[PDB]
From a paper:
In pseudocyclic proteins, such as TIM barrels, β barrels, and some helical transmembrane channels, a single subunit is repeated in a cyclic pattern, giving rise to a central cavity that can serve as a pocket for ligand binding or enzymatic activity. Inspired by these proteins, we devised a deep-learning-based approach to broadly exploring the space of closed repeat proteins starting from only a specification of the repeat number and length.
a–e, Crystal structures of the five-repeat design E8 (a), two-repeat design H12 (b), and the three-repeat design H10 (c–e) are shown as gray cartoons; the loop, sheets, and helix of the design are shown in dark blue, magenta, and teal, respectively. The approach generates a wide variety of structures strongly encoded by their amino acid sequences (as evaluated with RF and AF2, and further indicated by the close agreement between the crystal structures and design models), with between 2 and 7 repeat units (N), repeat lengths of 15 to 78 (L), and all ɑ-, ɑ/β-, and all β-folds.
Author numbering:
A (entry chain B), B (entry chain A): 4 to 139
The structure:
C-alpha cells in the first residue's frame, strides 16, 4: 500500500513510526505536527541516544546541524570510511553515503544499483524499506 | 537531455545560473561548492534583493528559516492567498504553493495537472522550466 504514497507522505509516516517507537509524545498529537518539526524531534531522539551532546544545544541547534550530526554518527557506527572526511563531506554526500549504507544492510538491493540510483530515489527506497519493516 | 539528469543535478545547475546572474559569486567554483552552500548563499541574495530583512540576521539564519522566509516573500508578491495564511502554512506547504505559482507564470502544463503532480515532481518541472529559460 506504500506505493501510492508519494515522497512527502513516506517521510511523514516513517518519522511517525520512529517517534512512536522512540521518545514519549502523545500519539494523537504526533499526526498534527508539521513535517519540519517531525524531523527536529525525531533527530533529537536520535542524537540524545547515540551521541550524548549538550542537552540544550540539541534543543536549539538548527535543523541542518541536527541532521549533520545524526548522519555523522550513522557513518561512525555503521561505516568503515575514515572519520576524517566525515566532517568535510558535504551534506549532499553524507545523506548519499548514509542511504547506501542503509540499503546494503537492511535492503535486498545489489550495490550496483545503490551506486547508480540517484539521491532522490535513494531516499525513496530507504523510506519504503523502513516502513515495511517497522510499520503497516 | 535535461530530463535524464537527476533532481540533485537539476538543482545544482539551477542554483548555479542563479548565482551567476543575480548577485556576486565568484564563478571560479562552477561545481566545487557543495549543494548546501549553493542553497544558502542563493537564499540570502533573494532575501536581500526581493525583501527587507536585516543583513546581520540572514548571514546567521539557519537554512530551514532562510527558505521559510523566501517562500513567505515569494508568496506575497506573486500569490493570491491572503497574508494571514502565509505565517500559518507549514514549510512543506509553502514549497508546494510556491512551486505551483511558478509553474503558472512560466508553465505550459494545465493547472489541473499541476495539482496532480506531487511535491517531488513539482520541483523537477520548476527546476527544468527554470533552466530552459536561463540556461544555454
Amino acid at each position: 500500500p506504500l506505493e501510492t504514497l508519494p515522497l512527502e507522505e513516506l517521510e511523514r509516516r516513517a518519522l511517525k513510526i520512529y517517534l512512536r517507537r522512540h521518545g514519549s509524545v502523545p500519539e494523537e498529537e504526533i499526526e498534527t505536527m508539521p513535517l519540519e518539526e517531525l524531523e527536529r524531534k525525531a533527530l533529537q531522539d536520535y542524537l540524545r541516544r547515540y551521541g550524548t551532546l549538550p542537552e540544550e544545544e540539541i534543543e536549539t541547534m538548527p535543523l541542518e546541524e541536527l541532521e549533520r550530526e545524526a548522519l555523522k554518527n550513522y557513518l561512525r557506527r555503521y561505516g568503515t570510511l575514515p572519520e576524517e572526511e566525515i566532517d568535510t563531506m558535504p551534506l549532499e554526500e553524507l545523506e548519499r553515503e548514509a542511504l547506501k549504507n542503509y540499503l546494503r544492510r537492511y535492503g535486498s538491493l545489489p550495490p550496483e544499483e545503490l551506486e547508480k540510483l540517484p539521491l532522490e530515489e535513494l531516499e525513496r527506497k530507504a523510506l519504503i524499506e523502513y516502513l515495511r519493516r517497522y510499520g503497516p
